[PDB]
Design a protein around this ligand. Sequence first.
Ligand SMILES: OC[C@H]1O[C@@H](O)[C@H](O)[C@@H](O)[C@H]1O
Ligand SMILES: OC[C@H]1O[C@@H](O)[C@H](O)[C@@H](O)[C@H]1O
Ligand SMILES: OC[C@H]1O[C@@H](O)[C@H](O)[C@@H](O)[C@H]1O
Ligand SMILES: OC[C@H]1O[C@@H](O)[C@H](O)[C@@H](O)[C@H]1O
Lengths: 133, 133, 133, 133, 16, 18, 16, 16
Amino acid sequence: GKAFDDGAFTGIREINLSYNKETAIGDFQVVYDLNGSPYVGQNHVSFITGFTPVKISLDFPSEYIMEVSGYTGNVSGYVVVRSLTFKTNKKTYGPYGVTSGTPFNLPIENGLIVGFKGSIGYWLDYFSMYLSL
Amino acid sequence: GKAFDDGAFTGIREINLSYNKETAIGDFQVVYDLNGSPYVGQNHKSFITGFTPVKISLDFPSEYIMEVSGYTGNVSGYVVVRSLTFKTNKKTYGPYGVTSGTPFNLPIENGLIVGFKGSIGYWLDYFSMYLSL
Amino acid sequence: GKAFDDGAFTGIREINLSYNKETAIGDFQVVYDLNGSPYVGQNHKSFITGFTPVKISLDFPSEYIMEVSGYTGNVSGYVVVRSLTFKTNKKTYGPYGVTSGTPFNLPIENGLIVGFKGSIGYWLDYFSMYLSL
Amino acid sequence: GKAFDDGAFTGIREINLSYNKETAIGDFQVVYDLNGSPYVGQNHVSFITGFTPVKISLDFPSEYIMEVSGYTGNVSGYVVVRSLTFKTNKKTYGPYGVTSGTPFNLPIENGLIVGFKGSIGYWLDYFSMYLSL
Amino acid sequence: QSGISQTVIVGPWGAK
Amino acid sequence: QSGISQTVIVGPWGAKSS
Amino acid sequence: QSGISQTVIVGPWGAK
Amino acid sequence: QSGISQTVIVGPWGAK
Ligand SMILES: OC[C@H]1O[C@@H](O)[C@H](O)[C@@H](O)[C@H]1O
Ligand SMILES: OC[C@H]1O[C@@H](O)[C@H](O)[C@@H](O)[C@H]1O
Ligand SMILES: OC[C@H]1O[C@@H](O)[C@H](O)[C@@H](O)[C@H]1O
Ligand SMILES: OC[C@H]1O[C@@H](O)[C@H](O)[C@@H](O)[C@H]1O
């Protein structure tokens, strides 16, 4: 897929992703906070269409992500991120996608997610997160 | 179990743990680096015995942990850490324990594990890791 | 004066300031690096005019500031920043302004300056710097 | 002089230094905090005697240093730290020594001093500070 | 603030 | 905590603020 | 060093 | 890179 790297910012305001409940995560875009002002990140789109859009609007800065979890597994021959769930100090967003396969979860006791990087072809191949105090 | 918190240090030099092929992880102790000098962490022991000891001696500072993975699962009605695997930039240590239950894994692209905290009763109930640049 | 706070970024590409050999530092504007891309910070201008412009273009990312020094002192009954000098790993820029009053200097052994904040009325009243690894 | 480097810790609990009204700072020793436990740093002593001892006991962790200032100057042909002042959120300790020469000051808006390194011969030749969140 | 240094902490994994 | 990232800040130098 | 700020990064999860 | 944690360091002040 096409690799992307948004870099690090001051926080997260909104997450816009698309998914297909029978395959995996597709598009991924983040509206970051950049020193008190919204910063619209690049929209990383799937090579194909047919996904269901989802807008996760956080009540920044009082609301923030405390845990990210999901599943990885095959879609055709490719290993991709099939599902994602975002848990904040206020609500749980998701799960979005196929909740089967190999699970993974990242609970954060102290710190914040301040950026994303990864790769997207037909689906989200993989992703990493920038963490900071 | 009895909670413990080693706190944060400069790095990791050696990890000493014990496991039982039929249950889970038992004892856990770490030799940290504190500004260039070894610092021996308190030995966190299980309430029982019958475990197999394992010594992971890292070639500090050229060798460091890049990924920690394992499994959590029910043992005698308790959710505990049944297995642990440590992957450094030089080799893989483990798996130690029982590779059954729900997997988890924490790969690190940039940064270092500099401390551990958790709880141990008959077995390792849970644990968290301090991360830093 | 009017307070400003650019916030924290990933690096510094260019610094644009103005001074007067008889008073102090006037205008201050920074072009930051934001995850590989230039980010033009707001231009913080003096309430008055008559200053001499100075452009400090750094050879990012190979060139970075290693020390900031200057002088603070009384001008028209106010305490302000009268002079500034920026020393990088390649060259020394300045001093710009009046080198009279109380000196100050911030040498950096490890780390980077990634942001500025302060206040400007007729002149630069004060300023602080964001530091990061 | 003889160089020293205490490294970085969790915080500062007590500072023990000595000075002479006619020369400069002599001995320097710090009792750090290491994850909640006091850690006595090595006592860095002058090659000579005749200094006046000072003990700065901070009300850790509610009290912490917000600014360190002092003077550097020539003493018997050597450039040394002639005076030091420690300002916390509760009180100001010092100045200790002679406030003659070139002043320097390090005010901290956000963050903490967590370690010291430097050199001491007859007097404190120079010093640097570790900063962290 | 407090005079205690902070660091990122991830987890816990295991029992809740 | 809050959802805002923080960094070390040194200063200010100039007019007194505290 | 270089003039670029660093941050802790965890992952990746998904394809190797 | 290094198995050693790093910290911001400012200074030195005094003799060069
Ligand atoms: O997303 C799954 C796959 O999508 C394809 O379009 C691409 O060629 C592969 O490299 C992989 O990214
Ligand atoms: O290790 C699993 C369990 O072990 C028991 O000994 C202890 O009483 C429990 O609280 C729990 O820790
Ligand atoms: O810059 C020096 C001064 O400039 C004046 O214009 C302003 O009213 C003062 O508050 C102070 O900022
Ligand atoms: O402290 C000032 C001087 O003290 C002397 O004892 C030492 O030999 C010098 O190198 C210098 O350190």
